[PDB]
Design a binder for this molecule. Sequence first.
Ligand SMILES: Nc1nc2c(ncn2[C@H]2C[C@H](O)[C@@H](COP(=O)(O)OP(=O)(O)OP(=O)(O)O)O2)c(=O)[nH]1
Ligand SMILES: *Nc1ccc2c(c1)Cc1ccccc1-2
Ligand SMILES: [Ca+2]
Ligand SMILES: [Ca+2]
Ligand SMILES: [Ca+2]
Length: 341
Amino acid sequence: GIVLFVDFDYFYAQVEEVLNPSLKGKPVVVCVFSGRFEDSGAVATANYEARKFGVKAGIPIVEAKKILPNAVYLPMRKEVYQQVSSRIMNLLREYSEKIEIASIDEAYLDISDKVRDYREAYNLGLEIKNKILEKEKITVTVGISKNKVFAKIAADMAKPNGIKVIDDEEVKRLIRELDIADVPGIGNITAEKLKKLGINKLVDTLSIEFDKLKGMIGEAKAKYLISLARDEYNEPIRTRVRKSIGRIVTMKRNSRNLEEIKPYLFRAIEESYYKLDKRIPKAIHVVAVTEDLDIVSRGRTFPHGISKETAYSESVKLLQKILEEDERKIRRIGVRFSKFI
DNA sequence: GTTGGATGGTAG
DNA sequence: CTAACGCTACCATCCAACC
Ligand SMILES: Nc1nc2c(ncn2[C@H]2C[C@H](O)[C@@H](COP(=O)(O)OP(=O)(O)OP(=O)(O)O)O2)c(=O)[nH]1
Ligand SMILES: *Nc1ccc2c(c1)Cc1ccccc1-2
Ligand SMILES: [Ca+2]
Ligand SMILES: [Ca+2]
Ligand SMILES: [Ca+2]
């Protein structure tokens, strides 16, 4: 059983460079502007040139501009990128039918019935890399391994513009040697709990007792880690099926004023219903981000589909509920539909 | 119990 | 106005419900 993982290089910045070859070689920062002040907002992604200087996803635009003022700042165009994204996701279909599209920029192919061994797998990788390079000018990074988690880890190790195999030998090796905080799904909070426990390596989960580990990092995460370490991890490549559409946005100034807030809430609903496209959701959630970035939400599930009209009235009763039950101002507001028929 | 909803935390 | 864009997926927990 063989899994090939593709993940596009600095994707949005790269699409801008292909849309503007002059930018190539020089720092490019794709950022969302917010409208609260001169350069309010955040960098969504930066090319590798930029990154060398500290400009990366999540930092304030006004900060990035401290560091790199001469650099090129470009407003995000999610729609332009999703189109390139989709063309690429179709080229990959041409190489395997069983494909798990994981994000705007990464997909898992199962290539078991296409290649005989990792050698042929590698070569297919090479071929995929060329094909996406020919037709879309984007460079990707490819990871090949026995399952999804380790094909991802391969890609993480190989990036910019690489291709890397992890054979059943090195899967065994990495279970013993890789920092457990590099295993997909293990972030800062989970890593600091595992260290306290004295678990630094995937193999260490077999030596600790299960109930004690459950106690710390939850059941789901426990099993996942154990399975990885036992070499039993074998979730299949399933087809992407969305469970949530949503859209939440940052207002021009903080407010508690229902009149000031609605136009945001309703532009949120219009885009969500538009993204839904034939999907009927049974549940709606209004989500507020307070003046100090704590996240608060309220919602409702109906026994039937939510019409756009019902979404309106309900989204306002939900927003009110928020303002009633929490007195902080509101910096971002938006909506999330779910539980589709 | 196992299930489902509301809300929230963690991750990518 | 004075820093923090925005997307989806999954799991944990508290807390009725339906036996
Ligand atoms: N707005 C926004 N988009 C993000 C963020 N993180 C990732 N993305 C989007 C934009 C990226 O171009 C796209 C793919 O990002 P990756 O996580 O795969 O890293 P990226 O491809 O941009 O550079 P790569 O060499 O992996 O690191 O996903 C983020 O914090 N904010
Ligand atoms: N707003 C936002 C935050 C994180 C991520 C996206 C959007 C898309 C994406 C893809 C892969 C990893 C992380 C993110
Ligand atoms: Ca990616
Ligand atoms: Ca990427
Ligand atoms: Ca990690």
